[PDB]
UniProtKB/Swiss-Prot annotation, chain B:
Glycans are attached at residues 14, 22, 106. This is Spike protein S2. Precursor of the fusion protein processed in the biosynthesis of the S protein and the formation of virus particle. Mediates fusion of the virion and cellular membranes by functioning as a class I viral fusion protein. Contains two viral fusion peptides that are unmasked after cleavage. The S2/S2' cleavage occurs during virus entry at the cell membrane by host TMPRSS2 or during endocytosis by host CSTL. Changing residue 9 to L: In strain: Omicron/BA.2.12.1. The record marks 120-121 as: Cleavage. Changing residue 145 to N: In strain: Lambda/C.37. It comes from Severe acute respiratory syndrome coronavirus 2. Disulfide bonds join 43-65, 48-54.
Length: 197, 229, 50, 87, 148
């Protein structure tokens, strides 16, 4: 489960294990111990042999820093993503799909973790759907009535207006519908009756 | 001297307002790389090459052939992961219905064509015909090998077809839970409410918007073919 | 060098003896005794994964 | 991708456990032996599309997921004079 | 031989170094493509310029060699016409502010239309709410608020 946090730990450990093992690699010299070279060699010739090790060890240390700069960019990208995600999912309700977890984002709770942060996105996942009969608009007084906030559904005989994410049957009145145009341009307009309060 | 563009002076007043009277549905294109070529190197072939005495001297530089091969290995796993996070975002692989009458919108150019054996849309067919011993076999003889990706071009085409069979037959419901059926003429009626306009704008001009979408999607095949860049 | 010495269909010129590839690698050669132009292909190699 | 010697290619499609390449995956399933198969992208659901049919959910389920994100790495500090020149 | 082995080994590290930097560029583009795959395709996004240039409506993903091509369907207004606006109107002593729309005038009459399309409708007591008197808002005009 906590695999993304062990990845950055094992990478830093492997980076320090390959760097410490490069000290046992003769870069074309007679040996790998500096004291053995300095003692068992005259000063003029020992310089040529000791320059092969300092060149390899300084290049191996530069390779470590180069990998740490590229690895820091990945951490900085994950840190800026976590800072933006916490600012948008915890301190607010984001309307971005899949950002604050899969589903309709309600809220989120941050929790500390070793070299990271664990989010608990509380999402809204609908379930137990049913198939109904829909229609764009209705025609009662020779004029089209469109759903203001909802959808015109039908159970087979009657017609109701429900929400777009939860089935709540409601009678079609002149308060949840608005009139626009006549009943000739809309394709698939059924003939129903509205109830004026 | 490089010019920045035209100089349009919007007449600002305390009681002047510009309300639109018509709309023009436009379909724009966007190009983004998702994956890179998975490469792998061979230390013995590249460094020395068909020799035995040089291979013995290479053993001195011990941790120099395993740190590079492991670094390129992480890239190979990365390229196979960058495709799962983009294309593999839906669990169920949806299929397009047989009757392709979606209110008046013609998706024949973006839906997969069953005639060709590749099962790719005409738009995708133009894309693969532009993004191209030989060089591929020459570099192989030195240690440079191109590992094949995990997901093939056929499997990626099935992921795109699943993302189009839930975008036309459904809306924003198959990306946040179970797939909920909804007519396409009613789907854009709710998408018009997101930008500000009401639902009567779409229904009273359904045939006009359908013709503009078909004309806009038809110029994509010509725009990409004409412009070489 | 090492490799397999098979026949080739590359039409060499009379003064041509050796032949390199795009990546500067010997791909063909002309036999000294008989004027036959072979095709030098490297020994079968690859990478194993367990 | 190559020549896989040590596994058998079963016609059944499962989830990818060990990625081999070119859509081929490997797993250790049941006699226990390593099997090879073509990775399955998921189930094959068919959404019924009609001109006058809509699906409105009647219930809901609150789900709490998790997302792991690294923030900081191990701060290192090497000694140049000690690493290159050991005593 | 130590001049070519070292030279070819450093050149090989130069390749891996550039491959790691270009991998971050591909990963950044892959995360942007994964973000647009869920915000433009899996739903409607209200972010400007993100899902195309204009009011985003829908997007269609298309596969491509080493990439993905998004076809963003945007809403672009056209045929603009100038009108005369007013913050609020005064009727029966109280100020009438619009709920969802803008007050426009064709020269003699006043109407209320939505902010993205010209749909002239009569000013009723159902699309305008009353809040305050007619002596604080600067620019308020006098009209008649019809009631059903």
């Amino acid at each position: 489960a906590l695999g993304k946090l062990q990845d950055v730990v094992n990478h830093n450990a492997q980076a320090l294990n390959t760097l410490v093992k490069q000290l046992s690699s003769k870069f074309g010299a007679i040996s790998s111990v500096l004291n053995d070279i300095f003692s068992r060699l005259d000063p003029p010739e020992a310089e040529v042999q000791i320059d092969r090790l300092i060149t390899g060890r300084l290049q191996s240390l530069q390779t470590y820093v180069t990998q740490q700069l590229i690895r820091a960019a990945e951490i900085r990208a994950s840190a800026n993503l976590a800072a933006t995600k916490m600012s948008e999912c915890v301190l607010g309700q984001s309307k971005r799909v899949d950002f604050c977890g899969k589903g309709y984002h309600l809220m989120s709770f941050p929790q500390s973790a070793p070299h990271g942060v664990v989010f608990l996105h509380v999402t809204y996942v609908p379930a137990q759907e049913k198939n109904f009969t829909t229609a764009p608009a209705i025609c009662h007084d020779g004029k089209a009535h469109f759903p203001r906030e909802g959808v015109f559904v039908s159970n087979g005989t009657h017609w109701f207006v429900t929400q777009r994410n939860f089935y709540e049957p409601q009678i079609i009145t002149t308060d949840n519908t608005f009139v626009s145009g006549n009943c000739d341009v809309v394709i698939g307009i059924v003939n129903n009756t509205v109830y004026d309060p | 001297t490089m010019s920045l563009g035209a100089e349009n002076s919007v007449a600002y007043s305390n009681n002047s307002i510009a309300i639109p009277t018509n709309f023009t549905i436009s379909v724009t294109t966007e190009i983004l790389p998702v994956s890179m070529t998975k490469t792998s190197v061979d230390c013995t072939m590249y460094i020395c090459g068909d020799s035995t005495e040089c291979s013995n001297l290479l053993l001195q530089y011990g941790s120099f052939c395993t740190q590079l091969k492991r670094a390129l290995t992480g890239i190979a796993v990365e390229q196979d992961k960058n495709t799962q996070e983009v294309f593999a975002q839906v669990k169920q692989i949806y299929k397009t219905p047989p009757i392709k009458y979606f209110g008046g919108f013609n998706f024949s150019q973006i839906l997969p064509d069953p005639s060709k054996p590749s099962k790719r849309s005409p738009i995708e067919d133009l894309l693969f015909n532009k993004v191209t011993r030989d060089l591929i076999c020459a570099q192989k003889f030195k240690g440079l090998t191109v590992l094949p990706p995990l997901l093939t071009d056929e499997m990626i085409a099935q992921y795109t077809s699943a993302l189009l069979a839930g975008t036309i037959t459904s809306g924003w419901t198959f990306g946040a839970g179970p797939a909920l059926q909804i007519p396409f003429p009613m789907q854009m009626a709710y998408r018009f409410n997101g930008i500000g306009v009401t639902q009567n704008v779409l229904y009273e001009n359904q045939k006009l918007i359908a013709n503009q979408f078909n004309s806009a999607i038809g110029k994509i095949q010509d725009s990409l073919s004409s412009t070489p860049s | 060098g090492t490799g397999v010495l098979t026949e080739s269909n590359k039409k060499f010129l009379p003064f041509q003896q050796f032949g390199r590839d795009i990546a500067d690698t010997t791909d063909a050669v002309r036999d000294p005794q008989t004027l036959e132009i072979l095709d030098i292909t490297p020994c079968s190699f690859g990478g194993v994964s367990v | 991708a190559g020549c896989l010697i040590g596994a058998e290619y079963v016609n059944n499609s499962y989830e990818c456990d060990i990625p081999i390449g070119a859509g081929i995956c490997a797993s250790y399933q049941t006699s226990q032996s390593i099997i090879a198969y073509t990775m399955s992208l998921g189930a094959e659901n068919s959404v019924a599309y009609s001109n006058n049919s809509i699906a409105i959910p009647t219930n809901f389920t609150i789900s709490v997921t998790t997302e792991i994100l690294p923030v900081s790495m191990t701060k290192t500090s090497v000694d140049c004079t000690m690493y290159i020149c050991g005593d």
